[PDB]
Amino acid sequence: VVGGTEAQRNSWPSQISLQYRSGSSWAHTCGGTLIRQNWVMTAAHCVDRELTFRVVVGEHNLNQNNGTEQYVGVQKIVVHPYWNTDDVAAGYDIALLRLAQSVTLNSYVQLGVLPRAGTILANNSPCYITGWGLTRTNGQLAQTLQQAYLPTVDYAICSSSSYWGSTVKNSMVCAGGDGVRSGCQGDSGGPLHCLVNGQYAVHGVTSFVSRLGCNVTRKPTVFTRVSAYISWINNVIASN
Numbered sequence: 001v002v003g004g005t006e007a008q009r010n011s012w013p014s015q016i017s018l019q020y021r022s023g024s025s026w027a028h029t030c031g032g033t034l035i036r037q038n039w040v041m042t043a044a045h046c047v048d049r050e051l052t053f054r055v056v057v058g059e060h061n062l063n064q065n066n067g068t069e070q071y072v073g074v075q076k077i078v079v080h081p082y083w084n085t086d087d088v089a090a091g092y093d094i095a096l097l098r099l100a101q102s103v104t105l106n107s108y109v110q111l112g113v114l115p116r117a118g119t120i121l122a123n124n125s126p127c128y129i130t131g132w133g134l135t136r137t138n139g140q141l142a143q144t145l146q147q148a149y150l151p152t153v154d155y156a157i158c159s160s161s162s163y164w165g166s167t168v169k170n171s172m173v174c175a176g177g178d179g180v181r182s183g184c185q186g187d188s189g190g191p192l193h194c195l196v197n198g199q200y201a202v203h204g205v206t207s208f209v210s211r212l213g214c215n216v217t218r219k220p221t222v223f224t225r226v227s228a229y230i231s232w233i234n235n236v237i238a239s240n
């Protein structure tokens, strides 16, 4: 997250850290959202290669014991059928991970609330992106969870030529693009929390940024629109 600030410990209890076995240790590779005691929602591009993964809930500082963490292995990975590894702009960047065990919900570990199917946010809606990604374009990962206010840019504006053009589909959500705040490498798969009628709901799964850099004017961070995949999510969970 570029242009943000450290979040209050455990203030985004649905945020998870997706890590892979790097021989001797574990390395953070993507964010994610806990949606069931044993299911995590993330980006397909985070898990479309054969690696050994684990999920950390109740996390804040990646390098120190905070005393609120729970570590659990990933048992099954379900990538969206239409996803193509080499074509992020086509969309369908979403995947569900079935955990080896159910985590214990408490003050530090909670389920993210999903929007009703088909829900579309008004332009400039108040949202926040959270993650341990780079804090600067070509910078380094954040040790502690960061957050940044990232208001939505509606589809009509986002798909305009001065913005993303045809690269963005209606199955995506754009947010930010002021050249100051944005998602960045390592934030992928994480949540875009939007405040709707007093409650925060996870409207997006962090997907991609421009080749020009993370924080670029008129190049908002692009998210998979969660409300476009509600039926799929429900079907996968029920069949597995």
Ligand SMILES: *[C@](=O)([C]([N]C(=O)[C]1[C][C][C]N1C(=O)[C]([N]C(=O)C1=[C][C]=C(C(=O)N2[C][C]O[C][C]2)[C]=[C]1)[C]([C])[C])[C]([C])[C])C(F)(F)C(F)(F)F
Pocket: 029, 030, 045, 046, 088, 089, 133, 167, 183, 184, 185, 186, 187, 188, 189, 206, 207, 208, 209, 210, 211, 212
């Ligand atoms: C993660 O945290 C990050 N996500 C990414 O890095 C995503 C996944 C694959 C590539 N990507 C990008 O953001 C990159 N964007 C592109 O590759 C890209 C190329 C071209 C176009 C475009 O304008 N098009 C026009 C017509 O032809 C092609 C499409 C759009 C996008 C970017 C880095 C250059 C963060 C969310 C940034 C991660 F991927 F998991 C990571 F941790 F590995 F980084």
Ligand SMILES: [Ca+2]
Pocket: 059, 060, 061, 062, 063, 064, 065, 066, 067, 069
């Ligand atoms: Ca920790």
